[PDB]
């Protein structure tokens, strides 16, 4: 129907190409009175979009709202939830602050976000930690909203695991930073992976505090979600080069593709609404001086152009595009991996060590280790076929297994290792405090010189 698509100013996207994004398309237009109104707003106060809703809901009963925010504010999503609850108009938060992660949407609202839930994102992050076997970790949660469900999901997922995750006691910030009681909690931290749950500015403050206290070591990893990190256009100070993040803000899968997919979902919903029901316009007259069917529970497993854009029970997508990124050496959020329908895709599965996170920060505890299979010492077995998990009294290994007898290029098969010298090396790494770097030999036996060639 009448759809007003107002956007922000992210990535300098012009307002002109969106008119031909639907215009020459929609060959089989079964709803006739369908129009688009492309709009931009130079201010992100609530008053602007409230005025837009009040003069465009009265503006010939516009039934469609697609909003994309360029700023870094999550209360805009709560305002859109309120507007979609009151006006009963389907609103699609696209990117930026338009689709940031809130706690619990209302049952009487038709708002949707084009992202994953915090449970799915925590599942992907724990899948990363399972694929890299980083079993010793911690958890730092502030008074940022939605923390009890998050810690509960982490504890149950550890309890739903075959790993036996080494979880340190959860560091809770009751009030603002004091450097009297928070410092004592930082001194208790000696694990590897740090899991932070706060805003972006508070994350910069905590990283600056950890850099001032020396808690930003190569051991001390940093995994935050997309809501902590935010948009790509702001990179503040005190960031380790290698800052692990998982976001759906794809610059490749750009804004025009997002809103075209939203148009396809809206046309699918309108086509099913016409094939099921007669009275297609369902709107409200005005805001001042104050429903038949819900489109919230109508387009659940919607699929447009072979894109799995099905809806969850929390307004999220079932399979959004999850992209794992890190910070490079050139202070940019470098794209690393993606996520399939079920399998975690790891392009850089070979994990880079990041010896230099900053200028004067050397790392000299990574020891390259190769071995050969001997029966009482080097016991190399398969990984789990169900969970891809070694039992935590074993260590991972990899091998450049060549496939064919003639070629020289092969794969890096990763397997489990138990034995005596395994335990010796683990007690050394607990004693000498280094990081073991185990892989397997591919040339053959121990050592034999053939004309100065070992």
């Amino acid at each position: 129907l009448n759809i007003a698509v107002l956007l922000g100013h992210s990535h300098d996207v012009t307002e002109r190409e969106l008119r031909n994004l639907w215009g020459p398309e929609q060959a089989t237009g079964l709803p006739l009175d369908v129009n688009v109104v492309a709009l931009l707003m130079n201010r992100t106060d609530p008053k602007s979009l409230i005025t837009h809703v009040c003069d465009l809901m009265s503006g010939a009963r516009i039934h469609g709202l697609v909003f994309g925010d360029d700023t870094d504010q999550e209360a805009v999503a709560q305002m859109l939830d309120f507007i979609s609850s009151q006006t009963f108009i389907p609103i699609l938060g696209i990117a930026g602050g338009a689709s940031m992660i809130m706690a619990d949407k209302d049952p009487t609202s038709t708002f949707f976000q084009f992202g994953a839930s915090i449970q799915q994102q925590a599942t992907v992050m724990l899948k990363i930690m399972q694929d890299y076997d980083w079993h010793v970790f911690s958890l730092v949660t502030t008074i940022f909203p939605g923390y009890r469900d998050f810690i509960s999901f982490i504890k149950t997922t550890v309890d739903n695991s075959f790993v036996g995750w080494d979880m340190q006691n959860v560091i809770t910030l009751d009030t603002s930073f004091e450097d009297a009681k928070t410092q004592v909690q930082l001194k208790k931290i000696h694990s590897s992976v740090i899991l932070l749950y706060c805003s972006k500015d508070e994350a910069v403050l905590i990283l600056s505090e950890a850099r001032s206290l020396g808690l930003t070591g190569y051991d001390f990893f940093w995994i935050v979600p997309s809501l902590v990190s935010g948009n790509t256009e702001l990179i503040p100070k005190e960031f380790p080069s290698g800052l692990i993040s998982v976001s759906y803000d794809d610059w490749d899968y750009s804004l025009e593709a997002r809103v075209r997919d939203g148009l396809g979902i809206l046309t699918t919903a309108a086509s099913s609404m016409l094939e099921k029901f007669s009275y297609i316009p369902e709107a409200k007259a005005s805001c001042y001086g104050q429903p038949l069917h819900t489109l919230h529970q109508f387009m659940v497993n919607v699929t447009w152009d072979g894109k799995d854009l099905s809806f969850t029970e929390e307004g999220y997508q079932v399979h959004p595009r999850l992209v794992v990124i890190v910070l490079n050496k050139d202070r940019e959020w470098e794209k690393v991996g993606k996520w399939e329908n079920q399998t975690l895709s790891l392009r850089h599965a070979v994990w880079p060590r990041y010896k230099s996170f900053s200028d004067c920060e050397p790392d000299d505890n990574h020891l390259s280790i190769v071995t050969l299979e001997e029966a009482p010492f080097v016991i190399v077995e398969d990984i789990d076929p169900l969970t891809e998990t070694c039992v935590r009294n074993t260590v991972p290994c990899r091998k450049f297994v060549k496939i064919n007898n003639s070629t020289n290029e092969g794969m890096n098969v990763k397997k489990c290792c138990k034995g005596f010298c395994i335990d010796i090396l683990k007690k050394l790494s607990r004693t000498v405090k280094f990081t073991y770097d185990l892989y397997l030999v591919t040339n053959g036996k121990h050592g034999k010189k053939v004309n100065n060639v070992w």
């Binding site: 106060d45 008053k47 209360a75 709560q78 706690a103 603002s176 805001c287």
Partner: protein
């Protein structure tokens, strides 16, 4: 210097009352050069153009705390949501003094929802204190609601972990239906008589009339209800001898808003005693950045200590509400509101009247069967 204050559409004398509180509070807080002001609203049933007038006026007015004080809505909205979301957009606390729902009182959904009243689930904590009154242990949970009901269940099991007993059966479902007589039969077939009941007015009244058509009103049927279950026709659809709860100085709107404005005024003077004074911006025109010291203002507010109060010794808990308020324990003695108990900060004091049960005599029924 000047400090604006937002107002509520309820009536006309509370404005002069907090102007009197302005005149009294500026006297007892030193000779500082602060100035206090006010900003009124109009009569609109919906909160949409109310929040529109808020963002027209109160954002540019640089108010410090909006104290929403309209419980008697003629419709069934009960929505202080958009003004609270507008203030939390620039991180400003709102004293929501209308209802006691935990879905409003969630820190996950609502950012700065700091008021003086607690939600109804604290009554369940008082019900845990009721487990100290008659020394009863086998309990049965029955909550029709789901949003506040799950958090009430979580804090109920948290307090239940202390005695290390457990509830016999927990029950949550969808309100509005009436075919819950099978649930009444499932409640009959359990060996506890503690009927922990939590619902709305009409739903609890309807399921109690369904229980009354099922013989659940006889001897031994122990009923324990709250404020929403004694309001309206649920007050009419209540037996003769049921035990309910009541607030003290909650319906007393004048003293409530009086010591609320006193709390706000001492908090403003306490922040003026503190450094790093940042004002909320005039975000209506042009200003897109937010007031960054909102959680800093919450760090100021959550550490508030008191010694005097009109309604009583107010104190913020770990969730920003009243610690152990004055509570009343009512007994509908033959369709007559008869107060039989009070509850101070730590103890239940019965009055000189008796405690009449809906079943047998005034003594407590031994509802623990020998199986």
């Amino acid at each position: 210097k000047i400090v604006n204050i937002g107002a509520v559409l309820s009536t006309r004398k509370h404005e002069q009352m907090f102007r009197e509180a302005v005149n009294q509070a500026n006297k007892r807080h030193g000779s500082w050069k602060i100035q206090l002001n006010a900003t009124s609203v109009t009569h609109k049933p919906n909160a949409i153009q109310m929040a529109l007038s808020v963002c027209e006026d109160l954002i540019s007015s640089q108010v410090y705390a909006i104290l929403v004080s309209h419980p008697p809505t003629p419709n069934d909205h009960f929505t202080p949501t958009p003004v609270s979301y507008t203030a939390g957009f620039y991180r400003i606390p709102v004293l929501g003094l209308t209802t006691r729902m935990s879905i409003y009182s969630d820190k996950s959904i609502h950012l700065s929802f700091l008021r003086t009243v607690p939600p109804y689930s604290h009554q369940s904590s008082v019900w845990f204190e009721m487990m100290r009154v008659y020394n009863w242990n086998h309990i049965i949970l029955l909550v029709s609601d789901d949003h506040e009901g799950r958090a009430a269940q979580k804090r109920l099991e948290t307090l239940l972990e202390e005695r290390e007993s457990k509830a016999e059966k927990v029950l949550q479902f969808d309100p509005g239906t009436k075919n819950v007589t099978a649930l009444l039969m499932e409640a009959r077939e359990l060996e506890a008589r503690v009927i922990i009941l939590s619902a709305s007015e009409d739903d609890a009244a309807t399921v109690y009339r369904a229980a009354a058509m099922l013989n659940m009103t006889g001897s031994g049927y122990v009923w324990l209800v709250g404020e929403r279950e004694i309001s309206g026709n649920a007050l009419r659809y209540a037996p003769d001898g049921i035990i309910g709860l009541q607030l003290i100085n909650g319906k007393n709107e004048s003293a409530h808003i009086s010591d609320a404005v006193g709390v706000v005024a001492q908090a403003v003077h306490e922040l003026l005693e503190k450094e790093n004074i940042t004002d909320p911006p005039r975000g209506c025109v042009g200003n897109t950045n937010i007031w960054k010291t909102g959680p800093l203002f919450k760090r100021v507010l959550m550490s508030s200590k008191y010694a005097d109060g009109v309604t009583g010794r107010v104190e913020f808990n770990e969730d920003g509400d009243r610690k152990f308020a004055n509570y009343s324990i009512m007994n509908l003695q033959n369709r007559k509101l008869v107060q039989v108990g009070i509850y101070n900060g730590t103890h239940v004091i019965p009055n000189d009247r008796k405690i009449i049960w809906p079943g047998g005599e005034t003594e407590k029924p031994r509802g623990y069967q020998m199986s």
